[model samples]
Target: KNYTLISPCFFGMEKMLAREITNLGYEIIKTEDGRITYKTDEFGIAKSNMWLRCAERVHLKIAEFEAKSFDELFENTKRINWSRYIPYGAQFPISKASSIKSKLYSTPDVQAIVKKAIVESLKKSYLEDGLLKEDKEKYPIFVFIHKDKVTISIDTTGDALHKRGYREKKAPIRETLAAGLIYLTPWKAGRVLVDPMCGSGTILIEAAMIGINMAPGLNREFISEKWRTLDKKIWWDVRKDAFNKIDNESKFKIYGYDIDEESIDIARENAEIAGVDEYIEFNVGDATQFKSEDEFGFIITNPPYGERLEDKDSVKQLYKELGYAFRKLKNWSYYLITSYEDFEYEFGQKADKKRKLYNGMLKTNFFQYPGPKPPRN
Candidate 1:
């Protein structure tokens, strides 16, 4: 059955998320600040969960309407046919919610009213005598209120899409943002990639996954996989097709170097878990010492923003050294995301282009310096 689905992402990643949705053969209805709505069927939902790289999660839109008071909220929400997705005994945890510039600023009140409305609707559907058993798989409900308009959705993706089931240790860039960075780049397979500040190898691993055409969510499980209404074959066959599409002989290789040996170990382990360790080389070294005769290579890195643990002066020096190291590589393009306002001055050159992006609430800019492409063989 066709359904209206919404995918939310980082603030600046709306267009990228929209592109990924359309690439998967879904119709992008609209793109907003941090969300995109699309029309997809049962298989499309399963495939989106397994393939969307920049989306935070896939949600089934329940209802949208104006609600100034609790009564309006209840009436509008109750109008939605809850039985279509929420089967009896389903654990509908209505914990995730947001309200901005709206009359329903009280989250607890909103949650209570929405939960009540859904329960009433479900009871009406099943003709239950009392409260629902409410003991089954997790079904997350999201209530988003903006400017007096309320949008209700149910999360089809659990554990957030960023939890790609590979990282045992945390890294700098979140996996979704890392995948977004890769999508924003002009990189493709057969090109060289170097990450000098690869803390836990997220960027390279994501690049490797893309280079070989591996689905981002292949190793992970989704909440909808357990839904009674969906066919099990949809999930299984999608995974089989993703598995069959891997380009094992892809000409993509990546290099990652970090100063800490422990971080290097974590990176190697993560790469192995991501099943792309064979495509990356991990080394322990200070980024300032990075050098390469590799021509026309691409350098995409998330250096220390000095936001949490490090000092500003040291990070500034690190940027300066990065400018020097990158200058040594022949005809190589360099892209770096950092929070330092004076990054261009410290790095000794202005970027060919600049894009403002956010890395987990720390505002940053991706400075792109384009170099000549590799000469055709």
Candidate 2:
């Protein structure tokens, strides 16, 4: 059966997510702020959950309608055929409810009303006289209200896709965000990639995964795997196809360096856990003195931006030194993400292009400097 899938991403990642969905052979229905809706089947559901590297979560859109009041919300929600998607003995929880610019703005009230409506509808369909058992796998529901339109969806992905089951330690950048940053660049397999300010090797690890076409969710389990409505064999088939597509024979030239020894150790461990340790070399080195033997390379890094007032001078000096060090590599392009407002002033160079991206809640700019492209052999 064809289903509408909604994938939410970071604030500036809608285009990348839409491109990813398109590359996966899915027809994009619409692209909105921070989210993309596409058309797919059950196999595509499993495939998307397993392969999407930038989406926060995959949601199966159940219904959409105008709900201006509580009565309209309850009536519209209850009119849906809930039994077709949700089975008996399964627990359906209204996991999240949000509202914006709508008369039914009370999130708690909306959640309660939606929950009651679903229960009432299910009871009538299942012919249950008493209360439900509510003892089985979980089917989480999400309610979103924008203006007067109501969008109801089920969470196909329980945990966010950023948790790729590799890093146990905390890092500054998220896996999904890291992957998105790399997608914004022109670097690919067989090219030299470096993250001089690497904290836990997230950028390099994500790069290696992309180089070999490894599915980001291959090592993790999703909530939809246990759904009774989806075929049990579909997940296995998608995984098998992903495994077969991996390019193990391709060579990779990826490097990660950090000033702190402990961070380099953690980076190495994370790369090992991600099965890309063999493709990356982690070293304890400062970005200010970064050097490389390769003539042409790509340096993608997330440098520190002092959040405190006292550390401002030191960060400025560091950015100056980093800019000086990067200038030594004349043929290498570089991209840096930082929250510093005067990054270009401190670095003593204007970026060829600049893009605003949100790292969690912090607003940062991605400074891009394009170098000469390699000649075709």
Candidate 3:
């Protein structure tokens, strides 16, 4: 059964997510701020949840309309055939409700009305007069109202896609955003990839996963897996296909370094859990003194931004020293993401290009410096 699907991503990653969807053979219907709507079937839904690295979550679009008042919202929501998606006794909850420049500005009021309308619709369809059992698999709903337009969708992915089930430790950078940053670079498999200031080795781990063609969600479970509407066999089939697609024999020159010893240990553990340990090397080293013999490599990192005022001078000195160390590798391209305003000045080099991106609400810039390409052997 073909359905309208929406995948939300980091604000600046809609195009990359769209490209990924196209690669998976889905036709994009619409591309908006931080979200892409596409057309796909049950198999596509399972495949998307398993393969989309940059998306926050995959949603099954239920309906869209213009609602200026609460009564309009209720009537419009009640018009949809609820039984087609929500089965009897299944728990359906409005997990998120946001209003922006809309007439129905009260999110709580909107949530209640939507829930009540859905229940009324479900009762009419399921012929249940008594209270709903609400004792089954969860179907989470999201309501987004912007400029008098309402878009309703059911969350097919229970948790955000960044929880790739590998990291036991936490880092400021998310796995999804890390993958997106890698996509922004020109690096590929069999090339040297380094993250000098790697905290938990997210950048290197994501690179290794891409190098070996491993699906990020292969080890994770989605909330929709238990939903009765989607066939269980489809999920298994997608997993089987993903497993088969991995290139176990591929060679990768990925390396991660950090000054903190505990961070390196955690990074090593994360790599092992992610099933890409063999392709990456983790070590405790200083970023300011980073060096390598590889002539043509890529340095992609998310260095500390020195959020505290007291650390500003040290951070600037670190950036200066980092610039000195990075200049030693004359034939390598480097990409750094940080909220620091004077990064270029401190780094002592102007980026060839710059892009505005949000690192989980904190606005940051992606500084790109492309070097000359390596000669063909």
Candidate 4:
């Protein structure tokens, strides 16, 4: 049983998916819009389900067929060998998304047809007639109908990775650890790293671990470990190999600061919880005017955007102040993932490199602000 993998929620996590997926060793078949198509043995599927942290939905592709009309849609839907994937007693569910460029103006209609087709296909495979039933929870099946072309996949990951277990409680509008790791894609070990906002210290913690070649998955458990279809021996070996790669201790300049005392405490507690408390420094200070002592460092951070908080303009002003503070540092390269657009509104400067990514459904940018060169005097 094969499936399609998709993470449409995080707008630009495509590369992040590729990075973590490959770091574990898998063949990526094709890269589609917010989707990674690949192949895995059922054991690999189980392992990824348990071990992959940054992915949203891990899917297994069962069938793909092109459709030009309603007749074609219904016909191709029946062509796949559905019984091999759907057992006699399992619940089946259909989820869909569509992009139409032709006469298929009714997205829901096409969805209904596909849903009807899948359920009907399964009913014929499982039941004597139209009747309710129970099995394991309905396997998550996604059907993408684009320009009348249809593709179907089964989801393997039980939950999304952004729900990394390290977060005990969130600050007012906190940056997700999954999103925080995205900014560190350009960084390597032994680089000086700082997170000015440092809410509960998730980013700083992730950076400290990543810089030391630590595994990010130590923070959570996976769903595949419990699946009945998986091979236990191979899963243990794969997991142990992944865990053995981590240092548990690494030397890196991972420091943090925030204006909120409560926030600072949270970061400290999170660090202590992760067992890397000594590797990070958190202080109460204004991020807008703060400076780090290290040269040749990387600043990967997230600041408050105008969401569920007061004073949106002031937040904008704070980020502008952040831009100025960024200008004050030496031998640093910046990666700022903020929901605010045109951060130059306050910083009075532009990013040397920029790309669009999601900070959890609110579209955002992962910006790289260049650090100043050391003085020649």
Candidate 5:
């Protein structure tokens, strides 16, 4: 079936998401700007939501139609028929996102348009046009708008996959799980992995997941659990397979440190939730002072971009010390992600490669510092 999956504010990353979903034998049937509707067996939905390390969420599209304005959008959306997916007396909610064109540009209005459409569609299906009330919990409907086109889907992952429910405290400045995994992919596992400015230990935890060959979604619940359309047994099979593939008993050193003690605690907590506490280290210390004998080491971290730094002067001083330390850490491949270009300058122009990435709403950059300079000039 030519199906679709919707993602949000996730442009350019869709390819990676599709790659991950494809690993589970799903065929990407459609690729939109932030979404790629795919075709897969019923069991694939659970594994897709539970194991996708980089996807924000997954939407299984039931139908689509042309709707250039409010009435057109509503009428087109309303005609799709949503009764077969949910049982009677089951409440449902509809979510929609559309481009700033056609007649519906506002998010709420667009959502209202979709909701109204779903109501009409379901009312017609149930044989009562106006008696059914909107119950947000029973039915989970997700809708997307691209100019004149409207696509409706069901949300399979409830909490946006990022909230694995492990983090109790939000760190002062933390890297998101999706971004953490993407950047960490460049670094190989088994060798020493460290995060100097490890705010909440996002990078460290992600590193441990890879090093141990663990599926990132094992600890989380998804929207698919509530969907009657998907087969639950297959998802569990996928989960057990993922659990078996990981080396839970293996040992590997994943170290993380921060100047803030609170951050250290949070990092430790997150690592524990991910079940990597035994092999990962969390401590409070200046990044400049971190040291180890392992030559084949890598540092992947998101340093404060001065937006939340304690003080401008202090941040400047931290950069000076950080650059000093980077110069000394000649054998370690380094990665620094920050929204401030000034932070990049502070470390000197030693970046061998760089990529533009976004952290939440902030535009950020990831810079790779070479392990060492080619022999003397």
Candidate 6:
């Protein structure tokens, strides 16, 4: 029952995603810029969709080959056993595609050809030569071509795994990325964690969930859950296992502060919906004056940055204040992400470690400064 699977995530978190997949009882076949390929089965598919903290989507690798023309694309795509997944009267939509430096670079042409190939294969296998019926569930397909190489995949996780069924959001950090950030930090349960610029409380909620070993997608649903080809019992069994694994004794707590009172309210609402509000504290506070009396804590934050001159001046001043607030917590680590080029310069100290990361379209750096570990007692 082993099958090749692919998970695409943000540009910099491939290792984290790989680690998660490895722990899920799968073999990692490859790791690239934005994705990782692994070997797993139906349970792996459900587990990955429900458990992976950093992946954007889990895809079933339908086929992979080199194609120089539309004819090659169609022929190669049709060679796969489509009947194994796409069921009778299913709504298969080959609507997404991207080509780079390939001979058959026309996206529309590629989509049409792949669609035709899948339909042909399905029809021949199902013994239906005429126009097929597709008035049921939708099966979304994707064709990604890079440098003349083609990879056809079916989306197993719809709406992106980042949609954790908790918050309807846009500007703040994504749940997958935020969970990845927490995993990158050194804090464990009982450790004090705070997000000074918590826009929608994503970081805090994700941290609490991780601290208690909660599955990020436990309360959510996936596209494959409704696929007739997959047994409904598979989903039920895995979800029950995930729910049973939740930790109730972990002393995990987090705090969020934002200057905007409305954002604070939204954060609290989101936390309640995520079922981790009991483990978090949200308050209205300015990052410039952000402070904690916990003595030892961790600061993981995403603050505003700008490119325009006037906007730059205003954000720069905020960074200075953030720098001052961070200095007060000498015994605590501060992990920040920002697009500002002069982050260290304005902060008055270079980070001990820095990494290039993408916050949506804007390229940012994860500036990490590891402080001394707090007392155990």
Worst 10 residues of 6 by lDDT: 168-177
Judge candidate 4 against the unseen true structure and give its global Cα lDDT, from 0 to 1.
Answer: 0.66
lDDT of 5: 0.69
C-alpha RMSD by candidate, in order: 2.2, 1.9, 1.9, 3.9, 3.1, 2.3
Q: How many backbone clashes are present in model 3?
A: 0
Per-residue accuracy of model 4 over 152-263 as CA lDDT, tens digit each: 7766555565555566755433323344354445676667777888777877776666555545555566554444444567667766776787775556557888887998
lDDT of each: 0.88, 0.91, 0.91, 0.66, 0.69, 0.87
lDDT per residue (tens digit) for residues 263-309 in model 3: 99999999999999998899988988888887888999998887789
Clash pairs (backbone) in predicted model 1: none
Per-residue error for 14 in candidate 3, Å, reads 1.3
At residue 132, candidate 5 shows an lDDT of 83
What tens digits encode model 2's per-residue C-alpha lDDT throughout 210-304? 99999999889999999988898999899898889889898776988888898899989988899888899999988898887777799999988
Q: State the displacement of the C-alpha of residue 199, model 6, in Å, after optimal TM-score superposition.
A: 1.4
Clashing pairs in 4: 2-60, 2-61, 3-60, 3-61, 50-222, 200-267, 320-346, 320-347
* Cα-based lDDT at residue 201, candidate 1: 89
Off by over 4 Å in 2: 373-377
The candidate, 3 or 4, that scores higher on lDDT is 3
Misplaced by over 4 Å in model 3 are 373-377
lDDT of 6 by residue, 198-291 (tens): 9989988889888888898898989989888787898899999999998976665688888889889999999889888889999998777876
- The candidate 3 region of ten consecutive residues with least summed lDDT is 167-176
